[PDB]
Design an enzyme around this catalytic site. Sequence first.
Site, mmCIF file in Angstrom:
data_model
loop_
_atom_site.group_PDB
_atom_site.id
_atom_site.type_symbol
_atom_site.label_atom_id
_atom_site.label_comp_id
_atom_site.label_asym_id
_atom_site.label_seq_id
_atom_site.Cartn_x
_atom_site.Cartn_y
_atom_site.Cartn_z
ATOM 1 N N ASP A 299 15.402 -2.589 0.813
ATOM 2 C CA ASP A 299 15.112 -3.937 0.344
ATOM 3 C C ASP A 299 14.216 -3.958 -0.888
ATOM 4 O OD1 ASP A 299 12.997 -2.927 1.728
ATOM 5 O OD2 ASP A 299 12.712 -4.666 3.038
ATOM 6 N N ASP A 380 3.699 2.350 9.332
ATOM 7 C CA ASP A 380 2.799 2.286 8.184
ATOM 8 C C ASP A 380 1.378 1.920 8.603
ATOM 9 O OD1 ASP A 380 3.951 -0.091 8.964
ATOM 10 O OD2 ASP A 380 4.010 -0.968 6.953
#
Length: 536
Positions: A299, A380
């Site tokens: 993306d 993350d």
Amino acid sequence: RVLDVEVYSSRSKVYVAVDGTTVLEDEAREQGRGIHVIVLNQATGHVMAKRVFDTYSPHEDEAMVLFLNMVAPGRVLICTVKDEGSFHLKDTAKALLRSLGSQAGPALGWRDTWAFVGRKGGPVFGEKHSKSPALSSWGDPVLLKTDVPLSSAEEAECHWADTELNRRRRRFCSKVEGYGSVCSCKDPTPIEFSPDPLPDNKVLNVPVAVIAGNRPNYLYRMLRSLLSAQGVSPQMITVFIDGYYEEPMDVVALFGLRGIQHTPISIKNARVSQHYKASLTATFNLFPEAKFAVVLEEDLDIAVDFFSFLSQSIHLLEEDDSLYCISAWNDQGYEHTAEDPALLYRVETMPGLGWVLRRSLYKEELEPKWPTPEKLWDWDMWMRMPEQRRGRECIIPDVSRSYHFGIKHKFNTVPGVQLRNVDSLKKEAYEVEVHRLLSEAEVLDHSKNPCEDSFLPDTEGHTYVAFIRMEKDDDFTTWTQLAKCLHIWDLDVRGNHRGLWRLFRKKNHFLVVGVPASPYSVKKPPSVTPIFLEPP
């Protein structure tokens, strides 16, 4: 020959049937809602596309008018509405439905059940309309027995010159629809790219890992940006798809890249986390001589100089072990707070969104302790916790080299940018420059309001300082509040370096220091009382 296509429109279910075997059903109760568009090639009747558009709801009619315009002409389109598709159809979509010879489609009304099968570009084959006699009543379920003439194997196909771009073009263009001008006989859009070569390129033999799922529309856009970036080596790109969805893989094969599939170890964010793990080990297995690895998700738009920006800066990663990563993404860098493309920062976070991972860090620290599939942690966030980051920092640029187009951030368009004073970002040299910048920077009027432009003199080029209340290295109350009213990222605390945030206000560099926590409070006059903002 000829195909017996059977399409069926109903209140709660909707189906299609191509020579006896139905290729889409949907009796589900709360979903599928709107026009369902199925697309089957004109010389074999294979499904090339399957769509749903909630035109009961606003603006999905615009998704449909787009998609039908992306379908190559001559092509038998079938439509079959269920539940309701009229409510937000709007004149434009009714106009397109008229163009394709449908007359019951443009006159479609409240909770009607309507089914249309026909060729794009004429003619029409079967249309079936049902009218809702009352507003609580609905169109009686419709079923439409059409027989659809099969075309030559030669008239369904686009006769391009036999370049093997167009060989892979035809293998893609005869398999899936909805990608438009890449599949159009006349004016066929390029499928490989001529990026200007980057000389002095140190990132030649760094693998590029593309993390992708079942979003073929995103990945096609992503790859076109990537393979257009100055200095790409498509050789080194491999697209890791998490699942055995064929459309995302066909996009990979269309550009002729290497595509790895991975069996989804689930669930949720754990499942993404395991795909990242699997893909990262895989990248270093495909490239055992590789010291680093570039990680891009599907993306993301890739800036022109993305590999220009990495080549100049990647030596910092191996020359300075206090560095966690290099990232293309400045959390705080929006169009009104970022200006210098040659400029770079150190931040005590791991932004992701196009980042460079070093092989040693992954296989020696991260991979052995990577969270199990049992735990539903974002990968993350886990990489940003102190056990993983261990106080290391990440190089970022002030203007980002990746743009996130999922579901106002500044993005570099200028190519071949020369970064200024790259080596000044090693640990100690960066500290030299930080102090250097606070010694030359003009202190601000801290009784004036920080949330308005009134805060900064009407000038361009100067560098300024403001001081905010930060009681501990954990107190981001005032900064979070500050962050909100300049209209940049506010949720979590990003872009801080030893209590210093670097941003641009009104084309002037602008420094925020948290007093007393930051070791840069030494630069704060005793006259100044540190700015403090409370929330509700």
